[PDB]
Design a binder for this molecule. Structure first.
Ligand SMILES: COC(=O)[C@H](Cc1cccc(C(=N)N)c1)NC(=O)CNS(=O)(=O)c1ccc(C)cc1
Ligand SMILES: [Ca+2]
Length: 223
């Protein structure tokens, strides 16, 4: 995360770290046995890590659970990243408590202008690289689709939304992929893509979760 702040140990209990010998993506615990992340974070042999703060030091609130099944969205398009979402099932249910809790799926979509909380262990520099060991937080508003398209001339699909600042300096970044975008206590988005990080007129694009609620609910009910 660029231009953010240190969240505070376990203050984002639903944030998860996907690990394959090292942290490579973020995720969100939606229930005792399922995690949601970005389809482009797909990889086999994923171990989900819950209750994390410093991903390099065992602090006492962690729970390491291997994934048993990964389900990429049926219409995921890696070239345009349309439908960049993925479901992961844990081998065993996690022990829920205050430091490890799930986040609710949204009942309705959030409007441009709303403030959201984005988090992750991603890179913290706009030019260069420096990875934090503890979780970083960032407050960012959802942008209107028209203003996003204008400043970036990108092709945003109805399954995406931009959030951040057109002035740059604050944004999600490499390693924050798959992470949660929480607005009004609900999971409204997933960190998907962008051009560089915190670039002026280059805000972050996020997967619009409200459009995949039926898909998510059906999938969990049969797997
Ligand atoms: C990959 O390395 C990076 O520094 C960021 C990561 C990233 C991930 C998610 C969200 C943000 C964000 N800004 N909010 C950033 N992405 C890029 O810089 C990608 N842009 S890109 O124009 O460099 C590009 C596009 C497509 C391919 C295959 C490779 C590279
Ligand atoms: Ca740890």
């Amino acid at each position: 995360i660029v231009g953010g702040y240190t969240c505070g140990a376990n203050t984002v209990p639903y944030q998860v770290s996907l690990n394959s010998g090292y942290h490579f993506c973020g995720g969100s615990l939606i229930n005792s046995q399922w995690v949601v992340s970005a389809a482009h974070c797909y990889k086999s042999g994923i171990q989900v890590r819950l209750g994390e703060d410093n991903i390099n030091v065992v602090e006492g609130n962690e729970q390491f659970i291997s994934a048993s099944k990964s389900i990429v969205h049926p219409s995921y398009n890696s070239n345009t990243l349309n439908n960049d979402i993925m479901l992961i099932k844990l081998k065993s249910a996690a022990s829920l408590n205050s430091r490890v809790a799930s986040i609710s799926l949204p009942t309705s979509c959030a409007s441009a202008g709303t403030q959201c909380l984005i988090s992750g262990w991603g890179n913290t520099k706009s030019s260069g690289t420096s990875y934090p060991d503890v979780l970083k937080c960032l407050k960012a508003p959802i942008l209107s689709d028209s203003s996003c398209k204008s400043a970036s001339s990108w092709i945003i699909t109805s399954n995406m939304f931009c959030a951040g600042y057109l002035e740059g300096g604050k944004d999600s970044c490499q390693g924050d992929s798959g992470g949660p975008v929480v607005c009004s206590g609900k999971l409204q988005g997933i960190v998907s893509w962008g051009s560089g990080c915190a670039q002026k007129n280059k805000p972050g694009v996020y997967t619009k979760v409200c459009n995949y609620v039926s898909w998510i609910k059906q999938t969990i009910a049969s797997n």
